[PDB]
Amino acid sequence: ADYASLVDVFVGTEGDFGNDMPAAQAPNGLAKVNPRTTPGRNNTGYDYAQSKISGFTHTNLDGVGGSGGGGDLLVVPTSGSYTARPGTGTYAHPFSHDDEDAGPGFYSVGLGNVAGTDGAITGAPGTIEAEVAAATRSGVHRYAFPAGSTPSLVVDLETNNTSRRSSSVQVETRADGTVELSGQVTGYFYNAAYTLYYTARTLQPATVQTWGDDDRLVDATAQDGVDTGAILTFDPADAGEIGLQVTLSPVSVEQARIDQQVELGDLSFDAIRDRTRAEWNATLGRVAIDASTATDPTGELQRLFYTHLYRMFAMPMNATSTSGTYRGVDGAVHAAQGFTYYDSWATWDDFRKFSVIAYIDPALYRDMVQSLVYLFADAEATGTGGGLGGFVHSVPTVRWERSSVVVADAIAKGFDGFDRLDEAYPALQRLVGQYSADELRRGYVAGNPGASVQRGYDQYGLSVIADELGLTEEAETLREQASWPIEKLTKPGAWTAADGTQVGLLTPRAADGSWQSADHAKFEAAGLYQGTLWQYHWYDAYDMDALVEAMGGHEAARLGMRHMFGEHAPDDGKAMLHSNANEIDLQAPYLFNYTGEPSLTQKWARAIYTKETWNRYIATGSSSAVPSGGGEFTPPLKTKVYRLDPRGMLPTMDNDAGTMSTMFVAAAVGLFPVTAGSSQFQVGSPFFDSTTITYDDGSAFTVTADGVSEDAFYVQSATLDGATFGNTWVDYATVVGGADLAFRMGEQPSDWGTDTAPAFSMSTA
Ligand SMILES: [Ca+2]
User: What are phi and psi of 640, to 5 degrees?
Assistant: First the structure.
């Protein structure tokens, strides 16, 4: 019933261990009411290890890198006074995790009172009780100040996790004495600027002063610049209850006002909070779990599951007004006709996540894909031919590579009626790019194996879209070019097995065709981004069949996969060639299904996600969080990859718009998308006795794992809708059609699935 209570929003909120936020937020909500720690923070604005909090920001990005995105509109409660633009140091309040409470839709904290004037502001007796909650587009605040205090709220419009580009504030005092503030914030993250409009109203009478770029605190009711803000001052009589309501719109201030009225009306703070909690319980309730003591003796695995399901519904964010409109990259307002438009993409990192969303919430997935299509269609409509990074985006956003694979994923899964797909296509083609004349002749990018395999997958994705558009010859060409990276860059005998077997591996190759020297296990060798050749070797997951053949045959692949996971030396951390910390080879644990050893896939799925494993690689060159260098743990570390702890992931292991969380959910369900852009999922090791996915029409997918335990993680046999089942993959249609997939589990590896019908490969389809 109350799934919300199982979510721990503090998981991954410490230091460099996930870069997630405890922010109050609704499912796929635009408004993200995040506490802000000081002097340290994680990328979202909050580091669990800190002991001071300034205030609450209203925009954000989940699990991203750099110094984080969003972080706009900082609201700081204070008993102090200002005569100039506030020093950010004066915002700091002591806090304790003992006086802090948060969950789906809400966050509460007891803040140490602060008082004084300007730079003399410091600790003062009493507590500012802070409560926030969130609706899709709105953040609501309720504060209690110590009796006798002159309550104040600073609205700081300079604050951003990366870069403030411009901001404005306009002040209105209404007949009842309450104040409304409105304007725009323009920020930047990674590739692009974005603009959001806001309205914020007090629920009690207030006076107001504003500041602009000259740091002067004045009575003027308008500011427009870069560093701007407002300071609200309330009557001491209202100390016991100070309320604020903030609403965001990518469209305009007037739309934000309309949204606030529709979304919040005259509802109380508690009602808004309760409603979002009910919305989370509906969302999380899409998956119902029965977890025995055998498999989850502490109850922590179930809590881990629902925490990560919660994280799965964060990005992309709802970027649609209550009037069914959105802002295009052309800078204009358009209709989201008969669907909700979502925006905020990090597709280079997160592309596999959508394949999972597809089987948990089909309708949400469809709207996401339709949105992605509109985004590229809008780019094309500008007629500039420019890439997406040259426009101002409607919400904070990241990057768009692999978009063709995501759209292809929906098409392959049987989704249709994607309006404006024909418009999206040429823009998707520009995103993917073309090999140069010389690259077309030789079949690859010289010295750049990474860019080559990436284009391979992009072109496969594009070939699916092309056929859907009736562009038959173009799809053929795309498929031909998509086969090149496997064929031309898999160097025969790059690694030699213990028995002499010659194993082909992804290797940089020169323009003239000679192979370039590389260490296949070295982080970022050969021009690679955030990985090794062993890891990028499996990248072209749309053609495992051709890859197996290029590697030197079935036995070569089988032995390569075992070497990949250090099976010959299970107690040597240096033998672990797979990385758990990054998304590059996320699919690797499930590739044993393709080499005739499904039991090893089962072992690794259960181990990585629910046990301690050997970890050799971090997600970046070095980390101050753990002894590390050259992209590795130095020494390799035996540890849990996922923890029910503020240190939630491995150090450096960013969640990346909920990707790592989504893969945890997929591992638990036991169905993993090795081939994004296909309709298939690979069978892993389902964690729970019973997992039921209920769809909107009342039908349900049910996967059972009879006798599953911490020790019994191997499949012994299986049935599908009552009949003997021996494949290690299942089609999307089977899942959403509401099948009953029943596994019998055991403590020893079995030969179940060793006679599987072949999974999808482009070359053999
Ligand atoms: Ca990453």
Answer: -75, 135
Q: In this structure, are residues 708 and 716 in contact, taking their beta carbons and an 8 Å threshold?
A: no
Ligand 1 centre from 619 Cα, in Å? 6
* Helix H or strand E encompassing 378: helix 362-381
Q: Are 60 and 396 in contact (CB under 8 A)?
A: yes
Name the experiment that determined this structure. X-ray
Q: Kindly state the helix (H) or strand (E) to which residue 275 belongs, with its residue range.
A: helix 269-284
- Domains located in the chain, CATH noted: 1-286 (2.70.98.10), 287-765 (no CATH)
Q: Which residues of 85-115 are buried (b: 16+ CB within 10 A; e: fewer)?
A: bbebebbbbebeeeebebbbbbbbbbbbbbb
CA of 732 to the centre of ligand 1 (A): 26
Residues forming beta bridges with residue 207, ordered by sequence position: 233
Angle between helices 347-360 and 362-381 (to 10 degrees): 140
Ligand 1 midpoint to CA 187 (Å) = 22
Find tokens 């077997």 and name the residue: 501
Question: What is the distance in A from the centroid of ligand 1 to the CA of 253?
Answer: 35
For this entry, resolution in Å reads 2.1
Whole-number Å distance between alpha carbons of 486 and 545: 10
Between CA 81 and CA 491 the distance in angstroms is: 69
Cβ distance 156 to 148 under 8 Å? no
Give Cα 124 distance to the centre of its chain. 40
Going from the Cα of 351 to the center of ligand 1, the distance in angstroms, rounded, reads: 12
Distance 587 CA to ligand 1 centre (A): 14
- 255 and 325 in contact (C-beta within 8 Å)? yes
Place of tokens 């959910």: 665
